[PDB]
């Protein structure tokens, strides 16, 4: 049961060593930006 957790955490450790956190943050913020965009599309904001 320690073996399972150690293996899963080793996977996480390797991913963290190969992927920078800045890229994760950039991806999350870009996704949030795009989601806000599609929100402002659904609300049909008029100039009137």
């Amino acid at each position: 049961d320690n073996m399972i957790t150690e293996m899963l955490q080793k996977e996480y450790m390797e991913r963290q060593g190969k992927t920078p956190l800045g890229l994760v943050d950039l991806f999350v913020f870009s996704t949030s930006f795009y989601l806000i965009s599609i929100f402002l599309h659904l609300v049909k904001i008029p100039t009137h």
Partner: protein, 53 residues
């Protein structure tokens, strides 16, 4: 935050396919967002209010 740290060490992590996919998805999301923002009407609203001024 650490996005600048990512930019500093771009060459040393571009060999991973996961990073390439993440970068491409971020760029695509930014492009789609910009398209939506500049077609839905937000910018039109800003221009309308400035025109009133």
């Amino acid at each position: 935050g650490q996005i600048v740290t990512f930019f500093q060490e771009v060459p040393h992590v571009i060999e991973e396919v996961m990073n390439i996919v993440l970068i491409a998805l971020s760029v695509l999301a930014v492009l789609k967002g910009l398209y939506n923002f500049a077609t839905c009407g937000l910018v039109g609203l800003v221009t309308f209010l400035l025109l009133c001024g």
